């Protein structure tokens, strides 16, 4: 029939219309229903914190190693990005999502109202009619390489959105480079081993918007997933919690102070470092009272080399833990398995 299921609703509009319950395509399926944690732990463990300005020192590099091996992510302080620039990119995000739907839909990622592409305002690809939908919208923009930006999908109001996002992305790219240099040293690989695969590499800004949900126990704001990136640099809502990370089968809340950044490895890095460091599975749970926003800067490698464990980590006593795949096949796997709520990297394990 008419594949209207391929063009899902804007979730912010569902919430504004006043749905009393999540429509059926957003409902989790038992397995995920039993694992939705809405209550905080009351005695959470301290989270790993890394001070970028101290990262040349052995003691700080050790804190990074502990974070990368045991958590897959860390809070980052003293990272050099002006606090007011962080405020501006988030507030201009709020200003965009607060615009009338008529205006926002000019940036829809459903071309002609039906044809899906990644870039734009909407949600991720709907592959099957029985696919579960997340309780969020997102504005997904290619920021890098700068010459490949399509400004027809960048909001023109607020007027400064483009300038502020580009300035913000310049800072997070510098952070990306500093972190990957420290990771190369931890792995005893050439300090520029990852820089070669980042030449003219794609990078994206994912502005997530999680509307309030009348039944936060029945949906996910964004489904459990690991990022497919090399590195993700995440700026979370400073007022509204919801991010959670999986560690040893348990979910725990991730709470960050304003202007602290969250850095996590993606599946590309887990493969390239042969699983010495882990790409963490995370999710966002909704709440019934307030919307939540986040901005994920998603840093991928270029398509010049196949994705595989670094040769310097492999020898006669140290086998590869993941098989080699082209970037095109890796991309299709990350995107396709996300739609099914499955973990693509598991299919690569040897």
Ligand X SMILES: O=C(O)CCC(=O)C(=O)O
Q: List residues binding ligand X (CB under 6 A).
A: 206, 208, 222, 227, 234, 236, 243, 282, 284, 294, 296
Question: Are 267 and 344 in contact, with CB atoms under 8 Å apart?
Answer: yes
Q: Which is nearer to ligand X, 8 or 280 (CB)?
A: 280
User: Residues touching Mn ion: how many (CB under 5 A)?
Assistant: 1
H-helix or E-strand spanning residue 298:
strand 292-299
- How many Å apart are CA 295 and CA 90, to the nearest integer? 7
Bridge partners (DSSP) of residue 116 are 110
Does 226 count as an annotated binding residue?
no
Stretch that binds Mn ion, among 38-46, 185-193, 207-215, 225-233 (CB under 5 A): 225-233
CB of 274 to ligand X, least distance (A): 23
By the 8 A CB rule, do 221 and 285 touch? yes
Is there a binding annotation on residue 79? no
Nearer to Mn ion, 227 or 237 (CB): 227
List, in sequence order, every residue forming a beta bridge with 294; answer none if it has no partner. Answer: 208, 236
Annotated binding residue 282: yes
Least separation, in Å, of the C-beta of 206 and ligand X? 4
Residue 254: closest CA among 76, 110, 124, 113: 76
Q: Which is nearer to ligand X, 184 or 230 (CB)?
A: 230
Nearer Cβ to ligand X (88/294): 294
* Interaction of residue 227 with Mn ion, rule CB under 5 A: yes
Distance CA 248, CA 240 (A): 25
Q: Which of 10, 11, 25, 8 is nearest to 114 (CA)?
A: 8
Q: Minimum distance between the CB of residue 281 and ligand X, rounded to whole angstroms?
A: 10
Q: Are strands 203-210 and 261-265 parallel, antiparallel or unpaired?
A: unpaired
**Any known ligand binding at 323?**
no
CA distance 160 to 13: 25
In sequence order, what are the residues at sequence separation of 6 or more whose Cβ sits closer than 8 angstroms to the Cβ of residue 233?
A: 172, 175, 176, 261, 262, 263, 296, 297, 299
The reply, when asked if residue 174 is annotated as ligand binding, is: no
Please state, as a whole number, how many other Cβ atoms lie within 10 Å of the Cβ of residue 262. 21
Q: Choose from Mn ion, ligand X, none: what does 206 bind? Cβ within 5-8 Å by kind.
A: ligand X
Instruction: Confirm whether residue 283 is marked as ligand binding.
Output: no
Q: Return the number of the residue (197 or 282) whose C-beta is nearest ligand X.
A: 282
Please identify, using beta-carbon distances, which residue of 242 and 320 lies nearer to Mn ion. Answer: 242
Query: What distance in Å separates the CA atoms of residue 96 and residue 161, rounded to the nearest whole number?
Result: 9
C-alpha to C-alpha distance for 264 and 281, rounded to whole angstroms: 10
* 140 known ligand binder: no
| Binding site feature residues for Mn(2+) | 225, 227, 282
- Known binding-site residue numbers: 208, 210, 225, 227, 282, 292, 294
- Residues of each annotated binding site for Fe(3+): 225, 227, 282
Binding site for Mn ion (CB under 5 A): 227
Residue ranges of the annotated binding site for 2-oxoglutarate are 208, 210, 292, 294
């Amino acid at each position: 029939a008419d594949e209207s299921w391929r063009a899902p609703a804007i979730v912010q509009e569902l919430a504004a219309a006043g749905v009393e319950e999540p429509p059926s395509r957003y409902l989790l399926r038992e397995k995920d229903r039993s694992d939705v944690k809405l209550v905080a732990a009351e005695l959470p463990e301290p989270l790993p914190v890394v001070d970028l300005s101290r990262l040349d020192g052995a003691e700080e590099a050790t804190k990074l190693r502990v974070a990368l091996q045991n958590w897959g992510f860390f809070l980052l302080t003293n990272h050099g990005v002006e606090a007011s620039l962080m405020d501006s990119v988030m507030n201009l995000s709020r200003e965009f999502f607060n615009q009338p739907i008529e205006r926002k839909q000019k940036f829809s990622n459903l071309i002609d109202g039906k044809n899906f592409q990644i870039q734009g305002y909407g949600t991720d690809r709907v592959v099957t009619q029985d696919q579960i939908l997340d309780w969020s919208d997102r504005l997904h923009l290619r920021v890098e390489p700068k010459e490949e930006q399509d400004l027809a999908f960048w909001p023109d109001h607020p007027e400064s959105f483009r300038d502020v996002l580009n300035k913000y992305a310049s800072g997070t790219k510098r952070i990306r480079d500093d972190i990957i240099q420290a990771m190369a040293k931890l792995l005893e690989l050439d300090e520029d081993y990852f820089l070669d695969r980042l030449n003219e590499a794609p990078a994206f800004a994912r502005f997530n918007y999680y509307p309030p949900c009348p039944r936060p126990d029945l949906v996910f704001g964004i489904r459990p997933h690991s990022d497919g990136t090399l590195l993700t640099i995440l700026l979370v809502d400073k007022d509204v919690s919801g991010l959670q990370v999986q560690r040893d089968g348990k979910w725990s809340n991730v709470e960050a102070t304003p202007h602290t950044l969250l850095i996590n490895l993606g599946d590309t890095m887990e493969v390239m470092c042969n699983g010495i460091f882990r790409s963490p599975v995370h999710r966002v749970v909704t709440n019934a009272e307030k919307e939540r926003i986040s901005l994920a800067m998603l840093y991928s490698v270029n398509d010049e080399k196949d994705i595989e464990p670094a040769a310097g980590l492999l020898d006669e006593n140290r086998p590869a833990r993941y098989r080699k795949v082209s970037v095109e096949e890796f991309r299709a796997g990350i995107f396709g398995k996300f739609s099914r709520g499955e973990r693509y990297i598991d299919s690569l394990r040897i």
